[PDB]
Design a protein around this ligand. Structure first.
Ligand SMILES: [Zn+2]
Ligand SMILES: [Zn+2]
Length: 231
């Protein structure tokens, strides 16, 4: 039932209900002549919605808001980007124009600015040191340490035991490292272990790209990152 690339024409977006009041959003982009899927999260926040991550670009993110209106019909009032790369901040300007309040850590905002990427409006305090967590509406935001990027956040939905790892967590089908240009390979397993330590009760774990699974995605990622380290 989870959608894959061949289900999703580029420019379209699918929603997937994970639990009561919790969805992923799935979109695709072409990169170097291959097509990659990308996940984000949507969490019901009373009669409003919280969005985690853009749908990887302006057109996708417009389509995302259109699909949310079509299928859920509650207002997206806030969005949080989990790190500074384009699959996470690309589309922030579309969200902002549509009246969504955009958020990221000050580390992410700064790195987005350096990269010339779109920059969320608001700055999330309380996430500066590895192991820091803050509640943000119906989710907990956690900074595990540097991993895929120095700023990467993960998002937990306590009502549903859903853990969204973003790009710090790989899907099982990914056997070799993704983009590690901005990674801290040295710290990435230590960061993954902080996630395990903080969220041992998680039932559904959503990678930045590809299929959900369970907490097995954590050690899977560590194995892949450690192999890449020793390449
Ligand atoms: Zn990234
Ligand atoms: Zn990513």
């Amino acid at each position: 039932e989870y959608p894959t690339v061949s289900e999703i024409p580029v420019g379209e977006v699918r929603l997937y209900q994970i639990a009561d009041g919790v969805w992923s959003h799935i979109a695709t982009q072409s990169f170097d002549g291959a097509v990659y899927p990308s996940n984000g999260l949507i969490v019901r926040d009373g009669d409003e919605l919280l969005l985690i991550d853009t749908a990887w670009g302006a057109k996708n993110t417009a389509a995302l808001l259109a699909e949310i209106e079509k299928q859920i019909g509650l207002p997206v009032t806030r969005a949080v980007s989990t790190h500074f790369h384009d699959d996470r901040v690309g589309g922030v300007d579309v969200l902002r124009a549509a009246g969504v309040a955009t958020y990221a850590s000050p580390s992410t905002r700064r790195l987005a600015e350096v990269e010339g990427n779109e920059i969320p409006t608001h700055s999330l305090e309380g996430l500066s040191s590895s192991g820091d967590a803050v509640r943000f509406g119906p989710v907990e935001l956690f900074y595990p340490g540097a991993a895929h990027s120095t700023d990467n956040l993960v998002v937990y939905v306590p009502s549903a035991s859903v853990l969204y790892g973003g790009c710090a967590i790989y899907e099982l089908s990914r056997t070799s490292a993704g983009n590690v240009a901005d990674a801290d390979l040295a710290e990435w397993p230590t960061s993954i272990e902080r996630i395990q330590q903080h969220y041992p009760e998680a039932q559904f774990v959503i990678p930045g790209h590809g299929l959900p699974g369970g907490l097995d995605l954590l050690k899977h990622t560590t194995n892949v990152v450690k192999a890449h380290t020793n390449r």
